[PDB]
Amino acid sequence: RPFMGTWNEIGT
Amino acid sequence: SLAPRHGSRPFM
Amino acid sequence: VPSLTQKKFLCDRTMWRIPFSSNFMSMGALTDLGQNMLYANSAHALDMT
Amino acid sequence: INLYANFFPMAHNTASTLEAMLRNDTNDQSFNDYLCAANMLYPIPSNA
Amino acid sequence: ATPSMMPQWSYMHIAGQDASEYLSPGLVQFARATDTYFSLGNKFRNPT
Incomplete structure (x- = not known):
């Protein structure tokens, strides 16, 4: 589930 | 912090 | 008396925006269409009016 | 009078995996009404 | 992402790692x- 807004490892 | 509660830099 | 209506949307202190993302949302700093290869790793022109 | 709807341009590869994934009986969506009412009005004669 | 411009981007935290692993x-x-x-939190970058 790589839909996130990855900052440096997925997830807000 | 630390564990004797609050503080700052005698812990690296 | 008979009447004809007028309108406006006075909106000061702000600048009109248009995100450069596909959904128009605010996905992140680096947009989702600022890294889509067709717009980076390539060249393009621009023409507004 | 005109209805109006705003669609999220969801990626198809992932939207289709939402249908076959939110349509499941287990994952159905259940709501609640905030006020949680059982409203009832009771008349009162003047000066009662 | 865009691999050909990934290195420099990562070098200057354009789209690289958060300020906890570099x-x-x-x-x-x-x-x-x-x-x-x-x-010192605000002296650094947290690319999103």
Whole structure:
């Protein structure tokens, strides 16, 4: 589930 | 912090 | 008396925006269409009016 | 009078995996009404 | 992403790692240790 807004490892 | 509660830099 | 209506949307202190993302949302700093290869790793022109 | 709807341009590869994934009986969506009412009005004669 | 422009992007935190894994671990420990009065958090980048 790589839909996130990855900052440096997925997830807000 | 630390564990004797609050503080700052005698812990690296 | 008979009447004809007028309108406006006075909106000061702000600048009109248009995100450069596909959904128009605010996905992140680096947009989702600022890294889509067709717009980076390539060249393009621009023409507004 | 005109209805109006705003669609999220969801990626198809992932939207289709939402249908076959939110349509499941287990994952159905259940709501609640905030006020949680059982409203009832009771008349009162003047000066009662 | 866009691999041909990934290196420089990552070099200057254009789209690289957060300020908890490129920072030398000692420095992150330091900043977490003295964020209460000498916050260094805003001196750095957290690319999104």
